[PDB]
């Protein structure tokens, strides 16, 4: 006990904390290992995802090497602050912290061969720009970028410890509106004016779930358009009936579009769902204009040719519109 | 530490809400006042007729079972206040305490688990979603008894029933948590919408056959 105490104090003694291991020698080599716990809500409005993980950095420091005391020591909160650790940081994070309750979720373990293992429990909100042009039929690519802040590749090299097995816990993710199709681990040397900095990238590919939108967006619009087509089969002299039908279908379409864009994320630029809804709106508007033409031509100014043409052309045109939309966006 | 926490803190008014107590034999009692936001994955497929199981997982961070072991002091009476808890949407039907030794490559770590089973109460859903949906679906059938020659009345009735169903569906989602996947309430609303749609479409056949040709 006291032997361990005085040996740890001696290990602290003679240690320069501002100097990395092997300052004049070859660069330090740090192996990263991530254990994902969960991916929380993913925001289209903010274009970011919140990720919780256990982040581990493994390296070798000959300064912190001891002989005897076969057990591997474990510094916890106070003397841990008196050791050099890499200045690793997440390039694209927007807000992150180490969990505090009950105690600081940090760990430092020193093996007798000078090896150091530094574990942290980190929650981080990372930026993920999204291509919301095929929304809700879109597929996204989010990334987490890990980089050294001050040291270039000549001083520190990073790598994935364990190779492709470095990152674990991907299966634990249970996002409601997204499914993780694939993930990748990449290592690069980004070149700045100062020099080549190390970089690691943990990338996920997400595919959105579509049945929600099929249930609440595409089906009601199609049903409302089919209802709007009923005017062509209603008698042409039923002015109040046909006018009420057409204008109320238009009102229902506007109601659907407005409340849909209220409940959906803001997303202040064009999507695919907007084009589909606008197509349905134009179809019902054209149906009402068709009745207006009928009323002016006949009964104003043996079914009539205008309605006979409408009955066959409107479903046919809507089918072609659906075909073009689905082929273009799928 | 709590393994499934997303954000937590110890209250610090008027001073740190912490307590240390010693006993002559050597026992130490260490108390904290903790507010924590824990993660609870939810199977909302049967919403609002669903039943959730929300857990709190307590685990040692660094030490393993060779160094530290956990137990619920007092056994099943180790957690209190659950009967006193009240929620606006849920009722705590049951709570359970479990103790396990999770295994990892480094070694076996101790774990305690406090699980709650929550049953959602449906009075307001029955009042605002299911009741007016059924009543409007019934109102859509009045067109069947309305005279076949009267076209304005039947068409207005059917299309306004469709509009009212659309209004109900939209405004519901202006209150319901977005929860963006299919739910039982959504299936029921879609069924009622299809029913009123077919009711309106029926007069199209009637009018075409018995007035048009």
């Amino acid at each position, epitope marked *: 006990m006291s032997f361990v105490k005085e040996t740890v104090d001696k290990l602290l003694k003679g240690y320069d904390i501002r100097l990395r291991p092997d300052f004049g020698g070859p660069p330090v080599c740090v192996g990263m290992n991530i254990d994902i716990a969960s991916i929380d809500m993913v925001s289209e409005v903010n274009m970011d995802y919140t990720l919780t993980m256990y982040f581990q950095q493994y390296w070798r420091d000959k300064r912190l090497a001891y002989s005897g005391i076969p057990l591997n020591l474990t510094l916890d909160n106070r003397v841990a602050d008196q050791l050099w650790v890499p200045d690793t940081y997440f390039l694209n994070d927007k807000k992150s912290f180490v969990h505090g309750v009950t105690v600081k979720n940090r760990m430092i373990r020193l093996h007798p061969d000078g090896t150091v293992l530094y574990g942290l429990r980190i929650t981080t909100t990372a930026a993920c720009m999204m291509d919301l042009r095929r929304y809700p039929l879109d597929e996204q690519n989010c990334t987490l970028e890990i980089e050294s802040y001050g040291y270039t590749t000549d001083d520190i090299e990073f790598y994935w410890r364990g190779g492709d097995k470095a990152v674990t816990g*991907v*299966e*634990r*993710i*249970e*996002l409601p509106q997204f*499914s*993780i*199709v694939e*993930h990748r681990l990449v290592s690069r040397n980004v070149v700045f004016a100062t020099g080549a900095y190390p970089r690691l990238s943990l990338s996920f590919r997400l595919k959105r779930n579509i049945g929600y939108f099929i249930l609440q967006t595409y089906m009601p619009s199609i049903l409302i358009t089919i209802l709007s087509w009923v005017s062509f089969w209603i008698n042409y002299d039923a002015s109040a009936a046909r006018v009420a039908l057409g204008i109320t279908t238009v009102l229902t379409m506007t109601t659907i579009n407005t409340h849909l864009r209220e409940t959906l994320p803001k997303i202040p630029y064009v999507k695919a769902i907007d084009m589909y809804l606008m197509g349905c709106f134009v179809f019902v508007f054209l149906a009402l204009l068709e009745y207006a033409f009928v009323n002016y031509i006949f009964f104003g100014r043996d079914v009539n040719a205008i309605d006979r043409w409408s009955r066959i052309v409107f479903p046919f045109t809507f089918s072609l519109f659906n075909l073009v939309y689905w082929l273009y966006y799928v | 530490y709590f*393994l*499934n926490d997303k954000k937590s803190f110890v209250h610090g008014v008027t001073v740190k809400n912490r307590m240390i107590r010693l006993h002559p034999d050597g026992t130490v009692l260490y108390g904290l006042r903790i507010t924590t936001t824990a993660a609870c*994955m939810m*199977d909302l497929r049967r919403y609002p007729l669903d039943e959730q*199981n929300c*857990t709190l*997982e307590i685990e040692s961070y660094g030490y393993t079972t060779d160094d530290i072991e956990f137990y619920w002091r007092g056994g099943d009476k180790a957690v209190t206040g659950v009967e006193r808890i009240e929620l606006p949407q849920f009722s705590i039907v049951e709570h359970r305490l479990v103790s396990r*030794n*999770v*295994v*990892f*490559a480094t070694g076996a*770590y101790p774990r305690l*688990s406090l699980s709650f089973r929550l049953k959602r109460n449906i009075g307001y859903f029955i009042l605002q979603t299911y009741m007016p949906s059924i009543l409007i679906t019934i109102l859509s059938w009045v067109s069947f008894w309305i005279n076949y020659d009267a076209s304005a009345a039947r068409v207005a009735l059917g299309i306004t029933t469709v509009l009212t169903m659309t209004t109900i569906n939209t405004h519901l989602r202006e209150t319901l948590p977005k929860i963006p996947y299919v739910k039982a309430i959504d299936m029921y609303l879609m069924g009622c919408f299809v029913f009123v749609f077919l009711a309106l479409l029926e007069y199209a056949f009637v009018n075409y056959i018995f007035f048009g040709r």
Partner: nanobody
Framework: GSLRLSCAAS????????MGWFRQAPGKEREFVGAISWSGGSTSYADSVKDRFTISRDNAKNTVYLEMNNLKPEDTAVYYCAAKGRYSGGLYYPTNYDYWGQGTQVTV
């Protein structure tokens, strides 16, 4: 040799999302063949049989399919299916898995 095993789950399947396939040859202990998540993505295979086998999922019927393309004579064993909690731990350790199956037999 196209063999397809099927592990069907009933009950509170949501509380035990991850499902793992193991194999136990005569004499040898249980070995982790594969693991599949709840949503059906992010499958994880062992090093020995990473490319030979493929695991699929369909929650509409609560069944997990383990396909095998090319079988070797070291693969003769009793194949088990198991379920794991959401905060159990690692995938490769059978102790973390709670509910096991009787297990089928395969010989080649």
């Amino acid at each position: 040799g196209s063999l397809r095993l099927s592990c069907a789950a009933s009950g509170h399947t949501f509380n035990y999302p991850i499902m793992g396939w193991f194999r136990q040859a005569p004499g040898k202990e249980r070995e982790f063949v594969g693991a599949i998540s709840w949503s059906g993505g992010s499958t994880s295979y062992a090093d020995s049989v990473k490319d030979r086998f493929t695991i699929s999922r369909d929650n509409a019927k609560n069944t997990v399919y383990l396909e095998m393309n090319n079988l070797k004579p070291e693969d003769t064993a009793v194949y088990y299916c198991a379920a794991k909690g959401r905060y159990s731990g690692g995938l490769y350790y059978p102790t973390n898995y709670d509910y096991w199956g009787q297990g089928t037999q395969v010989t080649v």
